[PDB]
Structure formats: C-alpha cells, structure tokens
C-alpha cells in the first residue's frame, strides 16, 4: 500500500507528540515527556485509499539538530507545529521551514502550518497572523487541540492530500 512519510517538527513543548498520540492512540498525553525521536506506523483509510502513515515525531531541542537533518531528508510531508500561547514558537517556525527547504533542496515541500493548543484561552498568536504566514508560504494553516482532538485528523489528512497533489 501507499505509504506517506510525515514528519512532525517544531519548537520544544508545542505538542508535536501530543498531536501524534491523539491521532494514533486517541488519548491526550498530559505529561512532561520530551522526545528524542519517535516513529509511529498506522494503517488508515483516507478518502477511500488504504494507506500507511509513517509518522516521525521529532525533538524540539537544539541538541538534536543533526538527527534533524536525517529525519527531514526522508520526509515527504511536514507538520510545522507551534503553540498559540507561545510567540517564540511561532517565530521559530520560520527556521524550521528554512531547514526543511535546505535538506529537501526544494522551495515547495508538502507542508501544513499547525497552530496547536487552541483550547487555551491565553492566546498570544492571533489566527490572522498565522494565516498570513501560511499564505505567504503557499501552505494551509490548520488550528488544532491535542487536548480536545479538534483539527487533529484535519492536520494529518490535509498533509496527506498535499502529498498526493505534489
Ligand atoms: N492545553 C493543551 N496542552 C497541550 C496540547 N498539546 C500538548 N499539550 C501539553 O503541552 C506539553 C508538551 O506537549 P508534548 O506533546 O510533549 O510537546 P512536544 O512538542 O512533543 N515536546 P518535545 O519537543 O520536547 O518532544 C504537555 O504537557 C502536553 O500535555 C494542547 O493541544 N492543549
Ligand atoms: Mg515530543
């Protein structure tokens, strides 16, 4: 079957792993549990296509940048995740995008901008600004909550659809 190699990237603590686990295991990890590198594989049906999601969950930490090149290079699609209550994470997005373009030798890699933690009242990043950014990239912006599961399948399935259209 078709396999889709999705990579989840972003700053430390934005909820990359919480999003992935919510997708694969339908629960919200409300734990402190920093990632080094995790992989998940799940057979799904998306729009009637039987396929395998190969999801690489990456570290937000600066120390793991080398293994970051390695993982990025094999990815077909990237979820670029920030937290809507953390302005630095949103600013860091630019640098993850640029590193993906560099390792992939590509200006237009399948990608979704994901604004996570939208369940939180204490927003510092407006939806308007994140949308403008995504528009300037030529990529969809999806807002998610790993906690309530809002937008979770949306973000992953939209990325699969971007890979199909590439
Ligand atoms: N309210 C809320 N909290 C969330 C959400 N997603 C993650 N969190 C919380 O934020 C913290 C970090 O999430 P986690 O999934 O470990 O983030 P990460 O990006 O994988 N961290 P790392 O880069 O270290 O692997 C956890 O305590 C988690 O419960 C969300 O959508 N809403
Ligand atoms: Mg993690």
Tokens read off for 16: 């990359």
**38 close to ligand 1 (CB < 6 Angstrom):** no
The residues facing 114 across adjacent strands are 81, 142
**164 close to ligand 1 (CB < 6 Angstrom):** no
Tokens read off for 66: 């080398």
In 3-state terms, what secondary structure has residue 111? strand
CA dihedral 6, 7, 13, 19 (to 10 degrees): 10
Cα-to-centroid distance, 146 and ligand 1 (Å): 8
Q: Are 162 and 46 in contact (CB under 8 A)?
A: no
- Determine the atom of ligand 1 nearest the C-alpha atom of 81: 19
Q: Which of 158, 80, 76 is nearest to 116 (CA)?
A: 80
Q: What CATH number should be reported for the domain holding residue 80?
A: 3.40.50.300
Return the half-sphere exposure (C-beta side, CA atoms, 13 A cut-off) of residue 8: 32
What is the tally of structural domains in the chain? 1
**34 close to ligand 1 (CB < 6 Angstrom):** yes
DSSP string, the chain: -EEEEEEEE-STTSSHHHHHHHHHHS----S----SEEEEEEEEEETTEEEEEEEEEE--SGGGHHHHHHHHHH-SEEEEEEETT-HHHHHHHHHHHHHHHHHTT-S---EEEEEE-TT-S---S-HHHHHHHHHHHT--EEE--TTT-TTHHHHHHHHHHHHHT-
The residues facing 81 across adjacent strands are 114
User: What's the domain range around 53?
Assistant: 3-165
Cα-to-centroid distance, 27 and ligand 2 (Å): 15
**59 close to ligand 1 (CB < 6 Angstrom):** yes
> How far is it, in rounded angstroms, from Cα 1 to Cα 99?
30
Cα-to-centroid distance, 70 and ligand 1 (Å): 23
State this model's resolution in angstroms: 2.1
Name 113's Cβ contacts closer than 8 Å, sequence gap at least 6: 80, 82, 93, 130, 133, 134, 137, 139, 140, 141, 142
**16 close to ligand 1 (CB < 6 Angstrom):** yes
């Amino acid at each position: 079957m078709t396999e889709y190699k999705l990579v989840v990237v972003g700053a430390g603590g934005v909820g990359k792993s919480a999003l992935t686990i919510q997708l694969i295991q339908n629960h919200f990890v409300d734990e402190y549990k920093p990632t080094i590198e995790d992989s998940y594989r799940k057979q799904v049906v998306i729009d009637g296509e039987t396929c395998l999601l190969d999801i690489l969950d990456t570290a937000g930490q600066e120390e793991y940048s080398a293994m970051r090149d390695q993982y990025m290079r094999t990815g077909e699609g990237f979820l670029c995740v920030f937290a809507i209550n953390n302005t630095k994470s949103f600013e860091d997005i630019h640098q993850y995008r640029e590193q993906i373009k560099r390792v992939k030798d590509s200006d237009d890699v399948p990608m979704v901008l994901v604004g996570n933690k939208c369940d939180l009242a204490a927003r510092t990043v407006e939806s308007r600004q994140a949308q403008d950014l995504a528009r300037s990239y030529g990529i969809p912006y999806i807002e998610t909550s790993a906690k309530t599961r809002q937008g979770v399948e949306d973000a992953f399935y939209t990325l699969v659809r971007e890979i199909r259209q590439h």
